Each structure stands twice: as structure tokens, then as C-alpha cells.
């Protein structure tokens, strides 16, 4: 399919013309935050660095430590994340769920389920560059038991590519998954973790439905969102992104604004990351799956420039 992204390289940009508007936004007795906010979600993150560096040689100033002494809460939150240069961005976000004590499962899940082969090749070459200790021993020392196999599994990068559909795999495959779920994924864990990690994404979706062909239920089925099991979380995720990456973080989305609170950090994390990559075909499926808007949503979840911003980013 093809893949859209919410945010485009502005045509007629000029980074010397935006280092002085975001300078004379920041300089100083209060600050022009409606300006600073339409002018970096209308840049892609590649005009942004090129600002970064304009402002840097006409003043002398580090556009980032500025933003930071000047934005504050979860609209500095979100301004930081967008100067992260794109090919870093994953990776630090892997680097602080790792980083201390106790670990972000859920960031981990997140983006090892939902990036490709290659762009996990990128972010373990770019994480090991920046943090000098390669991503897979940082996994490997935070995480545990099955998880952590599957995490390492993955990272490995190594999926079957999609080429001819043997119908005698798949369906052992099927049979195989269809009494690991039975089972409630405690038992023989070493062989399915094989079949979610390895298997080509084109096998793995005859997988789910000869599967459910077998059950009456959708492999999804089988586990709860909802409650515990970082290895289920994982699955869950797996499954969802071998059907639809864009949907598994439609969803992820949701998840963060319905409810209680909101989860900002996810909320940034997704809307930024993607933004250039397929934020457009996430839109699609939030509405068709949850009948309402991304934008829609957004609006009514959060406040103030930090909202003015996701709205932006988000688009239409
Ligand atoms: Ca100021
Ligand atoms: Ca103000
Ligand atoms: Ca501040
Ligand atoms: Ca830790
Ligand atoms: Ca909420």
C-alpha cells in the first residue's frame, strides 16, 4: 500500500527567514508560542534542522536549548520531539524506556512490533552510534523470560521475505498457534515465538485466518488487551501490525486518549514519529474502527498550544 504522512517539505521555505521569526518569537519579554507552534508543524523535520543551523549561524544561539528555556509542559514536550531529527527519534525513545530503573514496556512493545526490518536495521545502527551500547544488550538487560526472546527475535530484523505461500506451512502453522492459544501462550512458547518473528508478513496473515477457520475466533481473541502479560502485549501487537501498522497505531492512539487521563507521551510519540511516514493512513483507520476522528478526538482531549499543535500535525 502506499504511504502518506500528514507533514510535507514546505514549498518556498527559507531557513534564514524562519531562524529570525522563531528568534524574534523568543526574544525577549514573553514568548510567541502561537508562532513558534505554526511555524514547526508546517516544516518537515528536515527544514527544521536546516533552521536549526540558520539560527545557529546568525546568532549564535542554539535554537533547542532556547526553545527549552522558553516552552514549558507538554507543548515544550512536544516542540522538543519535533526537532529530534527523524532518524534519531526512535531510537531515543527506546534509549529513556530502557534507561533506569524498571523499564517502559509499552514503548518497547510499541516500536519493535510496529517498525519494518529496515527500519529497525537503521535504529539499531543509529542507537548503538548515539549510546555507544547496541540496542539488543540494553533489551536483553532490562527485559525477561519469553519477552525479552521475542524482543531479541525481532530485533534480529530477519523476517521471512514474501515469496511463494506454502499452503502446508501455513496451515501447520495454523494448528500449531490454534493449541498455543488454547493453551493461553504458556506452553511451548519457543515454537510460536518462532512462527510471530520469523514468518513473512504475507504467511502470517493466511496464518490468521486459516486460524480463525479453525476456531470461529480472531487470533486477537485469544488475548486481553486490556489486562497483564507483557509477552501477550507483545503478540498483540505483532498480530496487529502483521495485519495493519497503520491500525495497530490508530489504536494506540485511542487507547491513550480514552479513558481517565490522557497518555501524552504515546499521543506525542505517535503523531510525531509518524507524521512523515503514514500519519495520513493511521487517520483513515481511526475513523473507520473507532467512527470518529483523529482530529475530532484530539481537540476534545487536550488544551491549549499543545492541542493547536496536534490539530496542526494532524491536519484536517
Ligand atoms: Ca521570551
Ligand atoms: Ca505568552
Ligand atoms: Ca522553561
Ligand atoms: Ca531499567
Ligand atoms: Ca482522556
Known amino acids: 500500500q502506499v504511504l502518506r504522512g500528514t507533514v510535507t517539505?514546505?514549498?518556498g521555505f527559507d531557513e534564514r527567514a524562519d531562524a529570525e521569526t522563531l528568534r524574534k518569537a523568543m526574544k525577549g519579554l514573553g514568548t510567541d508560542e502561537e508562532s513558534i507552534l505554526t511555524l514547526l508543524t508546517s516544516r518537515s523535520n528536515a527544514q527544521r534542522q536546516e533552521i536549526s543551523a540558520a539560527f545557529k549561524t546568525?546568532?549564535?544561539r542554539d535554537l533547542?536549548?532556547?526553545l527549552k528555556s522558553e516552552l514549558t509542559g507538554k507543548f515544550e514536550?512536544?516542540?522538543?520531539?519535533?526537532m529530534k531529527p527523524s532518524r534519531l527519534y526512535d531510537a531515543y525513545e527506546l534509549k529513556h524506556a530502557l534507561k533506569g530503573?524498571?523499564?517502559n514496556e509499552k514503548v518497547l512493545t510499541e516500536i519493535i512490533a510496529s517498525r519494518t526490518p529496515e527500519e529497525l536495521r537503521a535504529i539499531k545502527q543509529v542507537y548503538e552510534e548515539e549510546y555507544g551500547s547496541s540496542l539488543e544488550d540494553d533489551v536483553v538487560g532490562?527485559?525477561?523470560?519469553?519477552?525479552?526472546?521475542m524482543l531479541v527475535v525481532l530485533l534480529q530484523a530477519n523476517r521471512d521475505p514474501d515469496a511463494g505461500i506454502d499452503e502446508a506451512q501455513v496451515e501447520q502453522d495454523a494448528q500449531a498457534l490454534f493449541q498455543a492459544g488454547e493453551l493461553k501462550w504458556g506452553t511451548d512458547e519457543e515454537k510460536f515465538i518462532t512462527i510471530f518473528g520469523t514468518r513473512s508478513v504475507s504467511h502470517l496473515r493466511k496464518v490468521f485466518d486459516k486460524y480463525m477457520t479453525i476456531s470461529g475466533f480472531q487470533i486477537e481473541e485469544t488475548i486481553d488487551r486490556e489486562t497483564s502479560g507483557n509477552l501477550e502485549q507483545l503478540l498483540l501487537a505483532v498480530v496487529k501490525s502483521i495485519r495493519s501498522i497503520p491500525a495497530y497505531l490508530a489504536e494506540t492512539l485511542y487507547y491513550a486518549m480514552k479513558g481517565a487521563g490522557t497518555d501524552d507521551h504515546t499521543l506525542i510519540r505517535?503523531?510525531?514519529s509518524r507524521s512523515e511516514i503514514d500519519l495520513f493512513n493511521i487517520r483513515k483507520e481511526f475513523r473507520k474502527n473507532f467512527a470518529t476522528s483523529l482530529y475530532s478526538?484530539?481537540?476534545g482531549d487536550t488544551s491549549g498550544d499543545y492541542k493547536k499543535a496536534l490539530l496542526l500535525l494532524c491536519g484536517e
Open 101 to 103: 530503573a524498571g523499564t
Open 64 to 66: 533547542l536549548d532556547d
Open 58 to 60: 546568525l546568532f549564535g
Open 9 to 11: 517539505d514546505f514549498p
Open 77 to 82: 514536550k512536544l516542540i522538543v520531539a519535533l
Open 142 to 149: 532490562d527485559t525477561s523470560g519469553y519477552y525479552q526472546r
Open 297 to 299: 478526538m484530539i481537540k
Open 270 to 272: 505517535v503523531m510525531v
